[PDB]
């Protein structure tokens, strides 16, 4: 089904109507009315520091590594978070901890390399690496953006309460 967007007598009434449109700029005045109208509408802006634009639970934001309640870090170095990262951001090398368990000696997410796809959130079997809510982690130096296991684990401890609430809200969906 198609439609003609712009597909198209001369009477004094008509012409006089058209001439007035050109002479007294009638349509131009119409446009001014629209803007005057909004001037009276409430502005939609938010005080940025005081009020924050709403983000729902799936917002990917900033990477964090979670820990079991007990206190044992969740990651068991299966290293498929490294396998599915599209940007090659996550670098993981591991060795058996004295406990005999399997843990990552080095876990480095290069956030400048990361494109925040959220697949790592997806891929982890123990769900140790999660996309944390925080989006405000702008840094003065490039090195700060590169993150080792200690920063991510620390990021995980700081935001664990909200991360747990967010995963709680969205796990049925996944």
């Amino acid at each position: 089904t198609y439609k003609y967007v712009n597909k198209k007598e001369v009477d004094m009434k008509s012409a006089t109507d058209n001439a007035a449109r050109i002479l007294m700029w009638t349509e131009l005045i119409r446009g001014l009315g629209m803007t005057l109208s909004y001037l009276f509408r409430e502005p939609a802006t938010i005080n940025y520091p005081f009020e924050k634009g709403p983000l729902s639970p799936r917002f990917r934001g900033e990477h964090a590594l979670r820990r079991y309640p007990s206190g044992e870090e969740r990651c068991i170095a299966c290293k498929l978070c490294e396998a599915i990262c599209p940007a090659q951001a996550i670098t993981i090398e591991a060795e058996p901890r004295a406990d005999g368990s399997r843990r990552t000696t080095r876990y480095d997410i290069d956030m400048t390399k990361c494109i925040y796809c959220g697949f790592c959130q997806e891929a982890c079997p123990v769900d140790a690496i999660v996309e944390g809510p925080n989006f405000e982690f702008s840094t003065e130096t490039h090195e700060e953006l590169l993150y080792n296991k200690e920063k991510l684990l620390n990021n995980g401890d700081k935001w664990e309460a909200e991360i747990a609430a967010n995963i709680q809200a969205d796990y049925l969906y996944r």
Binding site: L55, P57, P133
Partner: peptide, 6 residues
């Protein structure tokens, strides 16, 4: 507004 619970 992630959670409507204070």
């Amino acid at each position: 507004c992630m959670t409507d619970d204070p």
